[model samples]
Target: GGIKMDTQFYDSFTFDNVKYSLYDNVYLFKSGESEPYIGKIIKIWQQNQAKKVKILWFFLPDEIRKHLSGPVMEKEIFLACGEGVGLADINPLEAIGGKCTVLCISKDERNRQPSPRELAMADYIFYRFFDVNSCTLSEQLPEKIAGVEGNLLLNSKVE
Candidate 1:
């Protein structure tokens, strides 16, 4: 809903000579945040002189902790879906070291144990944060599922 760009008019769009696709993971520098925010590349386009990318940001545990009244456990993380999406410059040089992985879980399985493969593969696990049928954070992650470890903190240091 911010920064309009007529992507249809651009002949080509790329970052570091490679085309970024929908749902690809990216890192963006969010204002006032100590470290670069992790986001998914929802859209991309060429706008005159520079390339642009639309991103859906994932909320850091600290960010979510500020909003919640209770203490968040070490393994818990939240994705702020309500207003996480935004636009940014497509600069590969500004991106973080690697892509963050997000795993989709069904409503019934939200509180259940995640598979070994799922836990191993995911940087974060997401379930609908808000209700869509009735209307819903759109997604969330919790600590401890079926005795498997649920927490992960990647190379999050800022340079």
Candidate 2:
């Protein structure tokens, strides 16, 4: 099962005023990658936050969704066996060194950190839905899913 981009990036939508959702396949992988990493454009309230959006990733299946139960849970379980990391740790801003790109925030100040709801949402999508061992578009996955190669780690289109 070679990895393919599954998630589709939509448009940005407001949620609870303090939170926002950059919907869409904004969560896809590069061309040479297998599956799409759980990436998203999040806008946190920060004085120095970038005017652009930021890309955050969650690399675990179970952490993909908080409402992991019954059928959805079963599907995710059948996907991979591994752990995921928190979104706050990825910090796409640091990747570009505060230079806000189209997918990043461009401010001299720090973007607001993850709130409890944001963290919960991240946990749901990163841990509950996707797993680190579940293949990704990254040539540089974390140490956990590094050894998982082949179809077992690749992505396949399902329905």
Candidate 3:
């Protein structure tokens, strides 16, 4: 058996691309806003050396450099939906319904030893690649989070 896929996270990744793709035809929600955010996917590694997909994320776009937000080596900002009183009460984008827009994405890792809830959310994404369909990060999430030897998969950024 494997882990259940976090379709929401995957879907968010997809939509982020779509948003950037439609930069020309974007439906600007903000007044005087010229363009939507841009980003790129990145697979975080361990010991600074690992195969792609251990844990991953899409970095937010930096307009000036025209690159994804990341660590020194150009790491990406990974995101997951928060269910409780952190970040936001609603699930990112409420009126959009299942279409959550990214507010901000991180350029570095955050969180050392994550809680069960956080790990669960990350596992929902990582485990899917390996076909590990477990219910908990206890069974899924990699042995590290943001390069730390912990449970949760580092909330690198992205709210």
Candidate 4:
């Protein structure tokens, strides 16, 4: 028998006196996982007249490199915008691990050292779709070797 309760669309959801609108970043609680999964609310609806929430997830640096053809630098991390969508109950206080703030990071910024403030505020960085598809490397300055001289003086002795 194909019998089930009816579902409907919801404009938004309110939890703990805070109304969560579409596209708002939220932390998804995953059982047995150390850290909460970060995501953006893409859709909201009701099943059997009960509220539900849908989210598009972000990936950790390691997760991003898992399926890559080559290795990724430790400093690089990406948000899984096109994939990892999921559903959860609308009670964010119970369903959500926490709220997260995701930001768009330029290729230049990704190549540089992460600032303390930037490290603290951002959970994930979003790059262009084409950049992800092509997997292009960002320009980075070559690291200087300690005690190495580009040009040696005539009087200098080799150790």
Say which candidate scores most in lDDT: 4
Comparing 2 and 4 on TM-score, the stronger one: 4
Error of 3 at 117 (Å): 35
Q: For model 2, where is the 10-residue window of minimal lDDT?
A: 99-108
Candidate 1 lDDT tens digits, 19-88: 5455555556545665767665545556555556555455555545434555443334443332222222
lDDT for each of the candidates? 0.45, 0.32, 0.25, 0.47
Best by TM-score: 4
Clashing pairs in 4: none
Q: Order the candidates by TM-score, highest first — what do you get?
A: 4, 1, 2, 3
Per-residue accuracy of model 2 over 1-159 as CA lDDT, tens digit each: 553453233344343233343322133344566544444343322223323444444333454445333444211222232444433222332222211111111121222333445434332321222344444322222333323332222221221
TM-score of each: 0.52, 0.24, 0.19, 0.53
For candidate 3, what is the lDDT?
0.25
Any idea how many clashes model 1 has?
A: 8
Residue-level lDDT for 157 in candidate 2 = 22
Judging by TM-score, tell me the better candidate of 1 and 3. 1
Q: Candidate 3 on 1-159: residue-level lDDT in tens? A: 553442222222233334321101112122455543321222211222221212122222242233322232222223322222211111122111122222222222333434445544431222111111211112233444333343233333222
RMSD per candidate (Å) reads: 10.4, 17.0, 17.7, 16.4
Model 1, poorest ten-residue lDDT window?
150-159
lDDT of 2: 0.32
